[PDB]
Design a protein around this ligand. Structure first.
Ligand SMILES: CCCCCCCC/C=C/CCCCCCCC(=O)OC[C@H](O)CO
Ligand SMILES: CCCCCCCC/C=C/CCCCCCCC(=O)OC[C@H](O)CO
Ligand SMILES: CCCCCCCC/C=C/CCCCCCCC(=O)OC[C@H](O)CO
Ligand SMILES: CCCCCCCC/C=C\CCCCCCCC(=O)OC[C@H](O)CO
Ligand SMILES: CCCCCCCC/C=C\CCCCCCCC(=O)OC[C@H](O)CO
Ligand SMILES: CCCCCCCC/C=C\CCCCCCCC(=O)OC[C@H](O)CO
Ligand SMILES: CCCCCCCC/C=C\CCCCCCCC(=O)OC[C@H](O)CO
Ligand SMILES: CCCCCCCC/C=C\CCCCCCCC(=O)OC[C@H](O)CO
Ligand SMILES: CCCCCCCC/C=C\CCCCCCCC(=O)OC[C@H](O)CO
Ligand SMILES: CCCCCCCC/C=C\CCCCCCCC(=O)OC[C@H](O)CO
Ligand SMILES: CCCCCCCC/C=C\CCCCCCCC(=O)OC[C@H](O)CO
Ligand SMILES: CCCCCCCC/C=C\CCCCCCCC(=O)OC[C@H](O)CO
Ligand SMILES: *C\C=C(C)/C=C/C=C(C)/C=C/C1=C(C)CCCC1(C)C
Ligand SMILES: *C\C=C(C)/C=C/C=C(C)/C=C/C1=C(C)CCCC1(C)C
Ligand SMILES: *C\C=C(C)/C=C/C=C(C)/C=C/C1=C(C)CCCC1(C)C
Lengths: 230, 230, 230
């Protein structure tokens, strides 16, 4: 409780926990093989984020990084979280439009570079270098977003209407929510330090819960995840 | 030799080494594509554990963690070992009953959460928190065990008798041997400290060798791993 | 610029960057599903190595390891690089000859053991033990090389001539370039220290660029990556 951001970490933990249990129970009994894949992927995302939010709450996922003449608290657990949950979110989208194996590999690899370089930037001690890593990480994200539009949107329009409809919604949700992440990093404690840590934690918590639980609520209520059968 | 547990680490190293060479030689010449998959998965498990046991023997896979007012030796290499070998063991079982891709993902993800949270619990410095992680890790294991019974056992009974027979044996071996791990952790040096480190090392060594080499001897002598062909 | 090897790190960074952009642009528009897989795998290899070379250039991927009575600079970022790029290189070869899933798993697992044990050897503080890890790592490599000859070369000769032709070239390139890595390690700063660090950096840079960009130029100009169609 000595950390003013603790309230936002406690709430994020609870929402990810509650999201995980809901998806887990809703997924009971689903026999359709296709739907089970989406339930498996989408329930795993908040389970992972739950454990990492708890580690931040309890103080484990925190470290001090000297830069700018001060010791700055850096929650490295966020990057462990994103390293495993962001490729799962992209897999949900790719399996929806039945993307080829080469495009999937491109997306997951670019995603691993995005999060990995963001982690290096967060732990870098030379101030100016942190923004070099931020730029490479942001470059990788632009590739992802380009694929989701001028690489995926065309394949969805040649499939069942419920798939094209649900993909377009989740695509739009993804592009909006993902693009906010590099901004909060840059003006927050990891970058320019304009926004205090307790408010940055609040902002990441809203985005994290929307992009994981909110994403899952939309997808798992759709007919797109079920095969077309009689 | 200054560590009394060294004898159990030297023996575990030798048994994993010897297990690896046996499986490797036995796997020579096997042309059946199905059998080669099981040989590949099952020989990799003791190769990985061999390298990590050796690192513990040589003192690399060891660190000191202050908690309870003392410096406690923690063999972190065990979790690196289990992180890579336990999903391979589950893959052996899943491919046997030809489980769907969504169930496989659920098992491997839950398994990664189980080992990952066990690692955090082992390195946690606040005593009471170590058991919070132990509980989350144990919760993930119960999900795995539930899948192996009320998720897999039903699919094996609808397949070739030799597959149903071999799966049931390996399932039973797995549930018994895996369930002992959380107990040794709790009463051992990582938890309550009731059992001394040298005896905990002995107990993990017996379980490790049984669940990896013993598991492999049963599976790789079975007809289930071979396709049904003339 | 206080590190004499910086020139070789700056050049390696540039060549991996330039290699990545070339493959990325050349891969634009390729619609053939098979070719897209190879373009995806092969463009990812220099993208990863670019980021790790940059981390070495900027001083992040460097640490000091006491052994032999001195503090020795160890670029641990090389192993992070190789951990992710070497299995991708092997996947390029395996998909070319359409290898079975069990052989692929064997190659990637043996490759992960090779790099992982090389990392432990590099960070080991007991001098004699560094060569124990070097030997296990080299043993795993011999298994890989054996598979590429007496495991793959036979499957390529039963396929389209352009595949057999391109595989044989890339196989030969791989065996020659990979086998040099354990030698430079042994006589370089990580081992016997006969060759100074600045020259070891030069040697790894030539090998790294040849085995990644050079490899990719040969493969991606071949007809083998395209399906046979009218
Ligand atoms: C879905 C229904 C619920 C929607 C909810 C969306 C909330 C997302 C945004 C929150 C920003 C909050 C900003 C709070 C800033 C407080 C910091 C502060 O005190 O700033 C003044 C400072 O002391 C001197 O400049
Ligand atoms: C497969 C054929 C072989 C089967 C073999 C199975 C062995 C597994 C169990 C071993 C427990 C050994 C327990 C040894 C405990 C010694 C600790 C000790 O000395 O305890 C007394 C203490 O000094 C004051 O209370
Ligand atoms: C593809 C076209 C280009 C091909 C290019 C291939 C280069 C690869 C090998 C370089 C070795 C360079 C060795 C340089 C050694 C200098 C170290 C030195 O000064 O050694 C003397 C020392 O001072 C007292 O013994
Ligand atoms: C000076 C230049 C330095 C280097 C530039 C910064 C590198 C990091 C940024 C982005 C990753 C780029 C994407 C990497 C993955 C590309 C995969 C690919 O080529 O995919 C083609 C496939 O056909 C699709 O379906
Ligand atoms: C198909 C699979 C594709 C997979 C693609 C993966 C790409 C990873 C690339 C770059 C990020 C590397 C980040 C490494 C950061 C290590 C930080 C660390 O552990 O630092 C230790 C200590 O704090 C200081 O030395
Ligand atoms: C498509 C998604 C793209 C996402 C990526 C967009 C990146 C650029 C955005 C904002 C940078 C704005 C400038 C921030 C730097 C301000 C530095 C400074 O000095 O700020 C002082 C402050 O304004 C008072 O104290
Ligand atoms: C307050 C509550 C906090 C949260 C609870 C503790 C979370 C960690 C424990 C267990 C992981 C649960 C399992 C995660 C993976 C589930 C995958 C799934 O839903 O699989 C359905 C599929 O149909 C199958 O074949
Ligand atoms: C389909 C793929 C599914 C993959 C599912 C993976 C789930 C991983 C989740 C939680 C464990 C995270 C554990 C992270 C522990 C890091 C410990 C560490 O490195 O600590 C450094 C230092 O000792 C102190 O700061
Ligand atoms: C299905 C598989 C389930 C596996 C998981 C089962 C977990 C519960 C088991 C044992 C806990 C027993 C209590 C341990 C705590 C004892 C604390 C204590 O004070 O012990 C003093 C000691 O007995 C003298 O010194
Ligand atoms: C004392 C002996 C100690 C132990 C020896 C050193 C272990 C590490 C070295 C090499 C890894 C060996 C290869 C591991 C993977 C083998 C996979 C396999 O068996 O593959 C068969 C499949 O049929 C193929 O297609
Ligand atoms: C199909 C998938 C197959 C995957 C096969 C993977 C095999 C990995 C095995 C051994 C390498 C382990 C190396 C671990 C090195 C850890 C070093 C480290 O982080 O050390 C921290 C600190 O510097 C000191 O305690
Ligand atoms: C197929 C690929 C195989 C690749 C693996 C091949 C490994 C063996 C090669 C070289 C070792 C040569 C001996 C190196 C040890 C020399 C130690 C020493 O004392 O060197 C002094 C120096 O020569 C003056 O100062
Ligand atoms: C789990 C929820 C989501 C939407 C996570 C996404 C995270 C990112 C898109 C992170 C992006 C970063 C960039 C692009 C630049 C470096 C800083 C970040 C790692 C935050
Ligand atoms: C390699 C052999 C086996 C059977 C390894 C299995 C390891 C586990 C089942 C570990 C379980 C843990 C739990 C459930 C709770 C935290 C402590 C552990 C990581 C030991
Ligand atoms: C990215 C380019 C290539 C060819 C990388 C390959 C790296 C290896 C083959 C590393 C081999 C090692 C061995 C075999 C022994 C321990 C030291 C190394 C990790 C360098």
């Amino acid at each position: 409780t000595g950390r003013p951001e603790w309230i936002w970490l406690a709430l994020g933990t609870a929402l990810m926990g509650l999201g995980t249990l809901y998806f887990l129970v809703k997924g009971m009994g689903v026999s359709d093989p296709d739907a089970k894949k989406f339930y498996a992927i989408t329930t795993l995302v908040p389970a992972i984020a739950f454990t990492m939010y708890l580690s931040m709450l309890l103080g484990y996922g925190l470290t001090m990084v000297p830069f700018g003449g001060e010791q700055n608290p850096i929650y490295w657990a966020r990057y462990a979280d994103w390293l495993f949950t962001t490729p799962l979110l992209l897999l949900d989208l790719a399996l929806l439009v039945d993307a080829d194996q080469g495009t999937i590999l491109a997306l997951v690899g670019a995603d691993g570079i995005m999060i990995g370089t963001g982690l290096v930037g967060a732990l870098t001690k030379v101030y100016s270098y942190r923004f070099v890593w931020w730029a490479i990480s942001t470059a990788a994200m632009l590739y992802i977003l380009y694929v989701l539009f001028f690489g995926f949107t065309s394949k969805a329009e040649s499939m069942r209407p419920e798939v094209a409809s649900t993909f377009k919604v989740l695509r739009n949700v993804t592009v909006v929510l993902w693009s906010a992440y590099p901004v909060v990093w840059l003006i927050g404690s990891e970058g320019a330090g304009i926004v205090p840590l307790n408010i940055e934690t609040l902002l990441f918590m809203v985005l994290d819960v929307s992009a994981k639980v909110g994403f899952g609520l939309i997808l798992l209520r759709s007919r797109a995840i079920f095969g077309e059968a009689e």
